[PDB]
Design an enzyme around this catalytic site. Structure first.
Site, PDB file in Angstrom:
ATOM      1  N   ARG B  60       0.854  -1.187   0.000  1.00 21.56           N
ATOM      2  CA  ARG B  60       0.000   0.000   0.000  1.00 21.56           C
ATOM      3  C   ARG B  60       0.891   1.239   0.000  1.00 21.56           C
ATOM      4  O   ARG B  60       1.881   1.288   0.736  1.00 21.56           O
ATOM      5  CB  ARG B  60      -0.921   0.071   1.249  1.00 21.56           C
ATOM      6  CG  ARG B  60      -1.888  -1.099   1.464  1.00 21.56           C
ATOM      7  CD  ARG B  60      -2.796  -1.297   0.274  1.00 21.56           C
ATOM      8  NE  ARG B  60      -3.604  -0.114  -0.003  1.00 21.56           N
ATOM      9  CZ  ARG B  60      -4.270   0.071  -1.138  1.00 21.56           C
ATOM     10  NH1 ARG B  60      -4.313  -0.867  -2.073  1.00 21.56           N
ATOM     11  NH2 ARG B  60      -4.882   1.235  -1.352  1.00 21.56           N
ATOM     12  N   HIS B  97      -6.419  -2.900 -10.659  1.00 20.00           N
ATOM     13  CA  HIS B  97      -5.247  -3.190 -11.489  1.00 20.00           C
ATOM     14  C   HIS B  97      -5.602  -4.163 -12.609  1.00 20.00           C
ATOM     15  O   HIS B  97      -5.685  -5.377 -12.382  1.00 20.00           O
ATOM     16  CB  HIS B  97      -4.118  -3.793 -10.662  1.00 20.00           C
ATOM     17  CG  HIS B  97      -3.248  -2.790  -9.985  1.00 20.00           C
ATOM     18  ND1 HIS B  97      -3.539  -2.274  -8.744  1.00 20.00           N
ATOM     19  CD2 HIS B  97      -2.082  -2.219 -10.369  1.00 20.00           C
ATOM     20  CE1 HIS B  97      -2.584  -1.435  -8.384  1.00 20.00           C
ATOM     21  NE2 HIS B  97      -1.698  -1.370  -9.362  1.00 20.00           N
ATOM     22  N   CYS B 104       2.559  -1.669  -9.724  1.00 22.82           N
ATOM     23  CA  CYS B 104       2.433  -0.887 -10.946  1.00 22.82           C
ATOM     24  C   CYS B 104       1.546   0.319 -10.698  1.00 22.82           C
ATOM     25  O   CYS B 104       0.497   0.217 -10.054  1.00 22.82           O
ATOM     26  CB  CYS B 104       1.844  -1.737 -12.072  1.00 22.82           C
ATOM     27  SG  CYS B 104       1.643  -0.795 -13.616  1.00 22.82           S
ATOM     28  N   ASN B 118     -13.724  -5.024  -9.350  1.00 25.06           N
ATOM     29  CA  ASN B 118     -12.278  -5.144  -9.181  1.00 25.06           C
ATOM     30  C   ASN B 118     -11.861  -6.593  -8.906  1.00 25.06           C
ATOM     31  O   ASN B 118     -11.074  -7.193  -9.654  1.00 25.06           O
ATOM     32  CB  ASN B 118     -11.911  -4.191  -8.040  1.00 25.06           C
ATOM     33  CG  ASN B 118     -10.416  -4.071  -7.779  1.00 25.06           C
ATOM     34  OD1 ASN B 118      -9.647  -5.003  -7.992  1.00 25.06           O
ATOM     35  ND2 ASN B 118     -10.017  -2.925  -7.242  1.00 25.06           N
TER      36      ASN B 118
END
Ligand code: NA
Ligand code: NA
Ligand SMILES: [Zn+2]
Ligand SMILES: [Zn+2]
Ligand SMILES: [Zn+2]
Ligand SMILES: [Zn+2]
Lengths: 162, 162
Positions: B60, B97, B104, B118
């Site tokens: 995080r 992501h 990334c 997600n």
DNA sequence: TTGACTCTCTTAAGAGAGTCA
DNA sequence: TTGACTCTCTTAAGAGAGTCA
């Protein structure tokens, strides 16, 4: 420790009690535009739930039996699998609702698999829509579909390539 | 901060900094037996990470800027979407992501969607294996496959039907 | 032995905020 | 002002264990 015969007796008493739960007929998507029917054996919304059953959370229950003066307790959906390995690939096995109906305790609607495998069925296209689960899904997952994405990949400048 | 101009400045400075992260090429399954190539812009493993960035958890990070003498701080992947609605259908919008690579920060690998949308991409068959996500996946999900189910639906007696 | 409550925990996709220098 | 750490929280698929009569 409980013998295999004592465990079978626990599973049998569990089946006898769950079998008397209200049986609710649900029409469900199977994938590929087809509709099917599932018959869920639903634990009641409030006490009493059935012999041996008690609620430990808003949609969590446990099954309890006392054998030779020792209290034994199990998650309410785990009982069909007490004679199975309890982990696989280093991952804990979990009771997984093929019917996606948490109150249902129908053992024909449950399988026993990792939490990741369990979760992933929410998005499966279903047994008539391309399911590749080796233990096949009973229905299309409730979250299958195009989604509701608010914003896609984007940049303001030219710093990035995909 | 409050103004659209201030928000655009935040997005622009974030893009410039992330644009200097190392670019790591990842070859990825697309579904359908095909392979593609993604270019991830990966935040460093250890400090210093880049101007404005700090690690608040093992994977995080947060971006922070001082605007009008006041510190403003955001989850590190949320910055591209500061002008978008922060919720959809009463569900919080999350940075998602498409490359399934937490380090990334390439905004061309991110979308903004509910946590359910997600999560579900982990099991998507991918852009060449049947992805139906309206904002299309960049790769087959890492958890797509037959699974490793230990036990399937079963009953000992005759009290249940599917 | 049993019922009906109470409590906190796991996981892996994600978050917010405070303490220092 | 900026950096480098610390802490706990959210969600929705799932868990174990204590108290009292
Ligand atoms: Na499930
Ligand atoms: Na994700
Ligand atoms: Zn069911
Ligand atoms: Zn499936
Ligand atoms: Zn990436
Ligand atoms: Zn997809």
């Amino acid at each position: 420790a409980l013998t295999n015969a004592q465990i079978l007796a626990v599973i049998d008493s569990w089946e006898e009690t769950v079998g008397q739960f209200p049986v609710i007929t649900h029409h469900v998507p199977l994938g590929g535009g087809l509709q099917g029917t599932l018959h869920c054996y639903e634990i009641p919304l409030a006490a009493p739930y059935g012999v041996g059953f008690a609620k430990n959370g808003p949609t969590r229950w446990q099954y309890k039996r006392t054998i030779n003066q020792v209290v034994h307790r199990w998650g309410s959906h785990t009982v069909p699998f007490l004679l199975e390995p309890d982990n696989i690939n280093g991952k804990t096995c979990t009771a997984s609702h093929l019917c996606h109906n948490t109150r249902c305790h129908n053992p024909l609607h449950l399988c026993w698999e990792s939490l990741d495998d369990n979760k992933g069925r929410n998005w499966c296209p279903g047994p008539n829509g391309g399911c590749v689960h080796a233990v096949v899904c009973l229905r299309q997952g409730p979250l299958y579909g195009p989604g509701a994405t608010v914003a896609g990949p984007q940049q303001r400048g030219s710093h990035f390539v995909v």
